[PDB]
Structure 1
Amino acid sequence: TPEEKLLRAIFGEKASDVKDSSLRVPNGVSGTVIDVQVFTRDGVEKDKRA
């Protein structure tokens, strides 16, 4: 929208082409991560953690 393009021009920031969809802990829940499992599709390339 206008009066936001102006802000981006003023402060010289760039609108990211990727939006954050990260998995966040549900509100209120507070615990310790005891196990992580990664399932990768056959064709995909495994990441460092996998």
Structure 2
Amino acid sequence: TPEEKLLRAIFGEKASDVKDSSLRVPNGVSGTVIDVQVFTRDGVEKDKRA
């Protein structure tokens, strides 16, 4: 909207193109991470953690 455009102007906040979609803990549950598994479709290059 025009006002958000004026915002991005006055503050130079570059409106990024990547939306956030990260996976976050549901509210109310507070625990310990005890395991992380990573599957990747073959062909895809593995990242460090995998």
Do the structures match in fold with TM over 0.5?
A: yes
Task: Indicate the SS of the match to 2:3.
Answer: coil
TM-score, normalised on structure 2?
0.97
The structural deviation recorded for 1:23 is: 0.3
The structural deviation recorded for 1:24 is: 0.3
The structural deviation recorded for 1:28 is: 0.2
- Describe the superposition over 1:1-50 as per-residue Cα deviations: whole angstroms up to 9, x where unpaired: 10110010000110110011000000000000000000011010000000
Identity among equivalent pairs (%): 100
TM-score, normalised on structure 1?
0.97
Q: RMSD of the alignment, in Å? A: 0.4
Equivalenced residue count is 50
- Runs of at least 5 residues in structure 1 that lack an aligned partner in the other structure: none
More helix by share: 2
- Runs of at least 5 residues in structure 2 that lack an aligned partner in the other structure: none
Distance 2:25 2:13 in 1: 29
